[PDB]
Structure formats: C-alpha cells, structure tokens
Paper text:
We have been interested in a D-aminoacyl-tRNA deacylase (DTD) fold that is present across the domains of life in two different functional contexts: as an N-terminal editing domain (NTD) of archaeal ThrRS, which specifically removes non-cognate L-serine mischarged on tRNAThr, and as a freestanding ‘chiral proofreading' enzyme, which removes D-amino acids from tRNAs in bacteria and eukaryotes. Both share a striking structural and mechanistic similarity highlighting a common ancestry. Here we show, with the help of structural, biochemical and biophysical studies from three distant organisms, that the substrate specificity in this domain is determined by a differential remodelling of the catalytic centre at the RNA–protein interface rather than just the presence or absence of catalytic water as previously proposed. While demonstrating that the tRNA provides the catalytic group, we show that the side chains within the recognition site are dispensable for the proofreading function, suggesting a primordial mode of protein- or peptide scaffold-based enzymatic activity evolved alongside that of RNA.
On the other hand, the Lys to Met mutant, although showed partial activity against L-Ser-(Ec)tRNAThr in our earlier work, in subsequent studies with not only PabNTD K121M but also the corresponding K116M and K122M mutants of ApNTD and MjNTD with multiple batches of protein showed a severely compromised activity, suggesting a crucial role of this residue in enzyme function. However, a direct role of Lys in catalysis is still highly unlikely considering that this position is naturally occupied by a Met in the structural homologue DTD. We solved the crystal structure of K121M mutant of PabNTD and K116M mutant of ApNTD with L-Ser3AA and L-Thr3AA to investigate the structural basis of the observed loss of activity. A significant repositioning of the crucial catalytic water was observed upon mutation of the polar Lys side chain to the non-polar Met side chain, which is present in DTD. This provides a clear structural basis for the loss of function in this mutant, despite its high binding affinity for the substrate. Therefore, we show that Lys plays a crucial role in positioning the water molecule for catalysis rather than acting as a nucleophile.
Author numbering:
A (entry chain B): 1 to 147
B (entry chain A): 1 to 141
Write the structure that this text describes.
C-alpha cells in the first residue's frame, strides 16, 4: 500500500464519472463532500496487499493515526487514489482494505470521512506546508493471512 | 524518478520553512506563485537517477510532454515533491535534474513554471477529475 498524507485546511471532492463498470453504490448526496482541518490519506492499494488485507489495514491505521497525533489532526479523510502506485491490487480487495482502514480510524476516535470507490473524481485541497504536513508511507504485509 | 501528474484547474504555492540547511536562495516575489489550466508534475528525483542525469531528464521531458498533449495542457508546473520516493538523490543533483526537465519542457514551447527548491511549501490544487487527470510514471536510467 502507498499512502500520501497531506495535512490540509480542507478537502473538497466531486464524483465525475464511474471508472469501473460497477462502482460503489452511492446516493446523490455522496457525490460531493467537504471536510475542514483534515489529514487527508490518499491511498493506493497494491498487489502485495492482497496477501493480508487485515494486517496491512492494521498497519495503515497505526501509521495514519500516528501522523494525526503528530500534527494534532482530529479529522482524517480516506481518499482513493489508485495512481499513487503502478502495481494496483484488484478493485474488490482495494475497496475492502479502504473500508477496513476507514472503520479502524473511526474506532480510534477520529472524525473520519471517505470518498466513494470506483470513480474518476475531482478534488480541491490546501496543504498547510508545515514540516509534517506532507508525508509518504509504504505499508506492506509481513506474513500471509490465515483464514 | 517518480512522477505524479495531476491535471488541475490551478496550482498555487507559498514557500514556508526551509527543508534543507542551504536551500535555493530566492527573492520575496518568488515565495508565492499560481498557474491555471495546468498539468502539475510532482517530482521526486531518485538516487539511481544520479547515474545518468541527462538520460532521466530527457525521458522525463518526453513522458511529461506526451501526457500534456494527451490532456491538451498548454501549461506545465514542475513541483518538487521529495516524498514520492524513499531512495532520494542528493539535493544538488535533484535540483539540477528538475531544472533540466524545466528547461526541456520550456524548449518544447510549453508555458512552464517551477517552485523554489529546498523548502516546505503550502499549496492549493484542484484536480480536474477526468480519466487522465491523475497519472504516475517511474523513470530511471
Ligand atoms: N488499487 C486501488 N487503490 C485505490 N483505489 C482503487 C484501486 N483500484 C481501483 N480503485 C478505485 O477505482 C477507481 C479507478 O481506478 C479509483 N479512482 C481514483 O483513484 C480517483 N482518484 C480517480 O480520479 C478508485 O476509486
Ligand atoms: N530528491 C529530491 N527530489 C525532489 N525534491 C527534493 C529532493 N531532495 C530535496 N528536495 C527538495 O528539498 C525539499 C525537502 O526534501 C523538497 N521539498 C518538498 O518536496 C516540498 N514539497 C515539501 O513541502 C524539495 O524542495
């Protein structure tokens, strides 16, 4: 998994066109959204993550939470951004992992938001430009899952 | 080299704290900038690129130009974005390669801009959200 963390004044998004034949079923209101003072987690789920969705998600939750703790962010936004990596995981796995990360951050007590999966999407962001407002993290499985 | 290409309605930046002991000296007017209807090239120069700066730069110019034509972008912005890679080239080489890419794109007729090198920088961007508005490329010797 590849994650780009941008501590921003805000994030706005707008669904523009489906990118998959059968994207995530969303309501009209889910097509657009905005969150203030937010640590945006742009995430690309990679092929190697398919080995252990649970472990990778756990590590991602841990890494993202740590950064939020360092920059004092109370709001976190999970944003699908497939082209952060060149070796993408299958859609079904990507969606599952993104959901796991989203739920995990919620469990940690953060106010969490997320954009719909499977779409070409426009977005506006405003990076704060502080030393830790722009970071990258690579997270991968250490062991295959047992299920 | 790791390149993240975002076709945007605009890109704005503001130089803040230095991120290197001795960054690129700049004037007050250079601390801020904006470009519209632009293909933003977020670039991270990698350690392996140090082997052949000219080759990597040439290839980067070719690929970025290709995308610009595909999306019909007349404006291109070279944006230092170190985080895209773990194996970074040393500052002096990284800046030289970014300038080489800048010059190559400028040579081709594009309206090109670039941000100061060696700083933490605030920025505002608006991704168009078209199918080709977000792309990544890996270019190495
Ligand atoms: N491995 C992966 N990691 C993250 N997202 C992935 C994915 N595979 C498929 N997607 C989803 O399908 C859209 C088109 O690739 C993706 N859309 C996007 O990444 C938008 N930013 C495009 O504007 C995303 O919703
Ligand atoms: N290998 C490399 N590739 C691209 N840029 C590099 C670099 N090595 C050093 N820099 C410059 O120094 C700042 C801190 O790494 C970098 N700053 C940035 O990447 C800002 N976006 C941080 O907000 C950049 O100006």
């Amino acid at each position: 998994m590849r994650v780009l963390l941008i501590h921003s004044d805000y994030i706005e998004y707008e669904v523009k066109d489906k990118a998959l034949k059968n994207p995530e079923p969303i309501s009209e209101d889910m097509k657009r959204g905005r969150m203030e003072e937010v640590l945006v987690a742009f995430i690309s789920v990679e092929k190697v993550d398919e080995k252990n969705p649970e472990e990778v998600s756990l590590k991602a939750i841990e890494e993202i939470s740590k950064v939020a703790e360092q920059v004092k962010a109370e709001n976190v936004f999970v944003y699908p951004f497939a082209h952060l990596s060149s070796e993408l995981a299958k859609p079904s796995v990507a969606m599952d992992i993104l959901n796991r990360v989203y739920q995990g951050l919620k469990e940690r007590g953060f106010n969490v938001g997320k954009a719909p999966f499977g779409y070409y999407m426009a977005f506006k962001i405003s990076c704060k430009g502080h030393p830790l407002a722009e970071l990258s993290r690579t997270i991968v499985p250490e062991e295959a899952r047992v299920e």
